[PDB]
Scaffold this active site. Structure first.
Site, PDB file in Angstrom:
ATOM      1  N   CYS A  50      99.511  15.493  74.785  1.00 56.18           N
ATOM      2  CA  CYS A  50      98.299  15.447  75.617  1.00 56.18           C
ATOM      3  C   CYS A  50      98.102  14.063  76.223  1.00 56.18           C
ATOM      4  O   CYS A  50      98.006  13.065  75.494  1.00 56.18           O
ATOM      5  CB  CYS A  50      97.054  15.834  74.790  1.00 56.18           C
ATOM      6  SG  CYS A  50      95.493  15.665  75.705  1.00 56.18           S
ATOM      7  N   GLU A  52      98.296  20.115  87.177  1.00 56.79           N
ATOM      8  CA  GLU A  52      98.403  21.355  86.415  1.00 56.79           C
ATOM      9  C   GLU A  52      98.202  22.574  87.308  1.00 56.79           C
ATOM     10  O   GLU A  52      98.875  23.593  87.149  1.00 56.79           O
ATOM     11  CB  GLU A  52      97.372  21.391  85.298  1.00 56.79           C
ATOM     12  CG  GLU A  52      97.644  20.440  84.163  1.00 56.79           C
ATOM     13  CD  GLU A  52      96.559  20.498  83.104  1.00 56.79           C
ATOM     14  OE1 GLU A  52      95.537  19.787  83.247  1.00 56.79           O
ATOM     15  OE2 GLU A  52      96.734  21.260  82.131  1.00 56.79           O
ATOM     16  N   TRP A  81      89.088  19.087  81.067  1.00 57.99           N
ATOM     17  CA  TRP A  81      89.032  19.302  82.504  1.00 57.99           C
ATOM     18  C   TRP A  81      90.442  19.084  83.010  1.00 57.99           C
ATOM     19  O   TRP A  81      91.270  18.528  82.301  1.00 57.99           O
ATOM     20  CB  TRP A  81      88.083  18.319  83.175  1.00 57.99           C
ATOM     21  CG  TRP A  81      88.321  16.908  82.792  1.00 57.99           C
ATOM     22  CD1 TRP A  81      89.290  16.063  83.278  1.00 57.99           C
ATOM     23  CD2 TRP A  81      87.569  16.156  81.842  1.00 57.99           C
ATOM     24  NE1 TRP A  81      89.179  14.832  82.677  1.00 57.99           N
ATOM     25  CE2 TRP A  81      88.129  14.864  81.793  1.00 57.99           C
ATOM     26  CE3 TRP A  81      86.468  16.450  81.027  1.00 57.99           C
ATOM     27  CZ2 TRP A  81      87.623  13.866  80.954  1.00 57.99           C
ATOM     28  CZ3 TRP A  81      85.970  15.465  80.201  1.00 57.99           C
ATOM     29  CH2 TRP A  81      86.545  14.187  80.169  1.00 57.99           C
ATOM     30  N   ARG A 110      94.116  11.923  75.984  1.00 59.13           N
ATOM     31  CA  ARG A 110      93.585  11.591  74.666  1.00 59.13           C
ATOM     32  C   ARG A 110      92.688  10.353  74.600  1.00 59.13           C
ATOM     33  O   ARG A 110      92.115  10.065  73.553  1.00 59.13           O
ATOM     34  CB  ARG A 110      94.724  11.471  73.644  1.00 59.13           C
ATOM     35  CG  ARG A 110      95.212  12.801  73.069  1.00 59.13           C
ATOM     36  CD  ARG A 110      96.361  12.567  72.101  1.00 59.13           C
ATOM     37  NE  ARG A 110      97.622  12.237  72.780  1.00 59.13           N
ATOM     38  CZ  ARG A 110      98.652  11.644  72.187  1.00 59.13           C
ATOM     39  NH1 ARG A 110      98.555  11.315  70.909  1.00 59.13           N
ATOM     40  NH2 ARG A 110      99.772  11.381  72.874  1.00 59.13           N
TER      41      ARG A 110
END
Ligand code: HEM
Ligand code: HEM
Ligand SMILES: NCc1cccc(OCc2ccc3ccc(N)nc3c2)c1
Ligand SMILES: NCc1cccc(OCc2ccc3ccc(N)nc3c2)c1
Ligand SMILES: C[C@H](O)[C@H](O)[C@H]1CNc2nc(N)[nH]c(=O)c2N1
Ligand SMILES: C[C@H](O)[C@H](O)[C@H]1CNc2nc(N)[nH]c(=O)c2N1
Ligand SMILES: [Zn+2]
Lengths: 407, 411
Positions: free
Chosen positions: A106, A283, A278, A109
């Site tokens: 991720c 993506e 969000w 973070r």
């Protein structure tokens, strides 16, 4: 045993010691790296509990305190007696935040400590789960001012009373296999859109239909629920240049809410723990729109740009890819819905990484996943060496429920 | 033991057995993956099994395993090792070795080409002047007027480590970099340290933006000597854009031939510390990394200004936009001048075919995803969705420390 990581753009070297507290395994051996592979009892339980309580009590400057020892005793007693144990709210919250902090794949973070945790452990039915999920959606969405959140349903007891959200994300667009042969809607969701249609759902066999929820409580058969449209914030996709862009018929939802992972805290397993943040713009625009096995409209966009699609060396795909991602970002920013570009997020991650090395002795990171799917080398993470290892508490993958469900 | 890799875009699943033949370490453990880390004198004691391992592979590839030719060669090498503490490869073994070193290079996307390598045996070389001559001939052969041909030139192997042949240049052809008193850099910032050495060694620097660096060549462990590559041998390409006419006025050019010269070639336990090799460029090497890396020529800004981009928020993706046009210009310039180049779409597509072929014919294809995936537009190439396994096979190309850090100075 003490590892150094180098950034090659800045020459900054960090030293990692945190890996030495790793307990789970990577899939890699001394003879082979699997870095690019996407998916690598009472006595098991107490050391697992002990490990967690040890790190929890350390985080609040009460390691070796009466309270720590008391709690260890109490948990130990509960384990031998009950064959599992229950987390205190404070431990549950700590565990959830740290599962995110430990998520090596991720990039977002830096935000780990600002997570709203919703304790749903008192839930008993799919209707109950639906209510909790609606509340999560409403809270997280916050009229476009998105807020990170996780909702945690009862922990696994004995594998027969699992709570499971069958959707991969709370909000996703349907996809149907047509007789023409192609595909309408989202190709990723074809098998799932089918099972919904199977289970009783009336598909409005359209392209951008928000999928219903399929909720499994206490191991029972799953139930369909429609999310109230006013809770689903969607964003029309236009370009700040191509007026023809809106004609394409594209939109996307604001809330990415992953709902199929498993949360492990102190040996305990939470099979249903949907969480949301969000979007990073890539993506949607790179993966969701331009992937082959997804919405795959690179071809169509380039057409309307009247680019040369005869030879790959004109880089028409690259040209189109960029304009698309400019639009996604533009549309969300215009609509005041939280989104981050991949330059900002990766910059944030480098800062987070240096913070974590400074205050924790490391940051486990999966380069294969942290580096964005476009323009990789002009982002700072590309030149950053990363060490990947598994810390707990953690989010883990789990098999699709239908393959598993004892009907 | 069998291992499966999956392509998440096609769901093609391949089965790897080749990794069992792997010996060297990765760096990784079951506790940690070092997959993103860039770079993580040999007694006869360990030399013989290394030679035997290689000779077994070699005689298998020519369908003569266990033959008398095989056995005699084994004995001949054995005797030479216990007698002289090393051994000599036959030309045939040398060519096989170099080709397979390339075939085994897990970070190389251009490996579909591995069987077409021209091997130049320069093992009879003794001096830096001799090295200059072989390198000139390599450059002329490989360039081939723009119709590039892959080649490798192999200098004498290491003996005691005190008589190494080394090319001090990281690449045979590269532009100088000069740090200015005001902190700014003229030319290629990647080559600043090397440029300084050259200058110190007696090189008279033109101090321009695109000065081809001299060759600094070390034979038989002696101090390196400076040579200038004849400029008629250095094919260069003026960069222009097919739609933007102001692009030519940026004053950019690049050389045609990528020729990596600082690696170590290992074959059957023998170490060849000077083994310059060359192919042709993938466009992104120049247009993404060489021009747009913040630590290189770094012209994104100036290109973005001339495009009149919204350079205020990163979220305008002005950097991404400029990056694309620059890469279009690199490909355009090379194709127009008929100098061999390949775009990242073509090269990755070919690598996937190569890899599938290798899984079938060989049992696997070691591949380093971190390096195989291109530095722009990663997920719209087919390698992004491809699971890969990384492991080390010999023969191989290895890194070695920069010679200025290890060299014992003669005077
Ligand atoms: C708040 C802003 C956030 C941003 C910008 C962000 C960004 C991302 C991105 C880009 C990925 C790669 C996903 C993909 O390519 O499919 C990812 C993965 C992941 N994220 Fe974050 N995320 C955010 C919040 C969160 C939160 C709140 C959690 C958990 C509570 C989380 C946990 C994870 C996990 C576990 C993965 C890896 C999933 C896997 O292994 O397949 N993220 N994130
Ligand atoms: C003929 C066309 C070729 C193409 C298009 C090509 C492409 C590439 C690219 C793009 C890289 C990554 C380099 C970087 O980004 O820094 C690479 C790495 C590499 N290539 Fe190839 N290559 C070719 C030929 C060759 C040849 C002829 C050899 C050796 C005989 C070779 C051996 C290697 C090795 C050893 C690496 C790894 C470098 C490292 O580990 O730092 N390649 N190649
Ligand atoms: N791609 C396979 C796969 C399977 C299961 C989960 C998953 O996670 C992707 C993921 C997870 C969490 C996220 C949080 C925020 C965000 N913007 N994207 C996120 C994307 C990815
Ligand atoms: N960036 C670290 C480093 C250090 C030393 C050599 C090297 O080589 C990269 C490399 C190696 C071989 C290549 C062959 C062909 C090509 N077009 N590029 C190639 C690029 C890379
Ligand atoms: C940290 C990371 O290993 C390093 O920046 C790598 C990443 N991938 C790369 N890939 C290629 N092809 N070339 C490179 O130089 C690098 N650099
Ligand atoms: C094969 C490869 O591991 C797979 O395509 C991965 C690569 N990197 C990724 N990186 C991110 N952020 N998200 C992904 O889904 C993937 N997919
Ligand atoms: Zn690894």
């Amino acid at each position: 045993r003490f590892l150094k990581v180098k950034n090659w753009e800045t020459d900054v070297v960090l030293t990692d010691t945190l890996h030495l507290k790793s307990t789970l395994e990577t899939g890699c051996t001394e003879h082979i790296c699997m870095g690019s592979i996407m998916l690598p009892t009472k006595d098991q339980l107490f050391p697992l509990a002990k490990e967690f309580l040890d790190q929890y009590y350390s985080s609040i400057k009460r390691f070796g305190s009466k309270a720590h020892m008391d709690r260890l005793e109490e948990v130990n007693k509960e384990i031998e007696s009950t064959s599992t144990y229950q987390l205190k709210d404070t431990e549950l919250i700590y565990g959830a935040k740290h599962a995110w902090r430990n998520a090596s794949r991720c990039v977002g973070r830096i935000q780990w400590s600002k997570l709203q945790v919703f304790d749903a452990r008192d839930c008993t039915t799919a209707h109950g789960m639906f209510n909790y999920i609606c509340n999560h959606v409403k809270y997280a969405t916050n009229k476009g001012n998105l807020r990170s959140a996780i909702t945690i349903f009862p922990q696994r007891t004995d594998g027969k009373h699992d709570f499971r959200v069958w959707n991969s994300q709370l909000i996703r667009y349907a996809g149907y296999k047509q007789p023409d042969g192609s595909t309408l809607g989202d190709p990723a969701n074809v098998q799932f859109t089918e099972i919904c249609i199977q289970q009783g759902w009336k598909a409005p066999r359209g392209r951008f239909d928000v999928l219903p929820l399929l909720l499994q409580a206490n191991g029972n058969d799953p139930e369909l629920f429609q999310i109230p449209p006013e809770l689903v914030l969607e964003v029309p996709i236009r370009h700040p240049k191509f007026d023809w862009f809106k004609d394409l018929g594209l939109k996307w939802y604001g809330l990415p809410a992953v709902s199929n992972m498993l949360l492990e805290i102190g040996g305990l397993e939470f099979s249903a723990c949907p969480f949301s943040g969000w979007y990073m713009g890539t993506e949607i625009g790179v993966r969701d729109y331009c992937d082959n096995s997804r919405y795959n409209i690179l071809e169509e966009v380039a057409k309307k740009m009247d680019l040369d699609m005869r030879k790959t060396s004109s880089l028409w795909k690259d040209q189109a890819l960029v304009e698309i991602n400019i639009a996604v970002l533009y549309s969300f920013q215009s609509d005041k819905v939280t989104i981050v570009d991949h330059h900002s997020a990766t910059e944030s991650f480098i800062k987070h990484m240096e913070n974590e090395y400074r205050c924790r002795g490391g940051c486990p990171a999966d380069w294969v996943w942290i580096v964005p799917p476009m323009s990789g080398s002009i982002t700072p993470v590309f030149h950053q060496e990363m060490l990947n290892y598994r810390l707990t508490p953690s989010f883990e993958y789990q098999p699709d429920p239908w393959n598993t469900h004892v009907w």
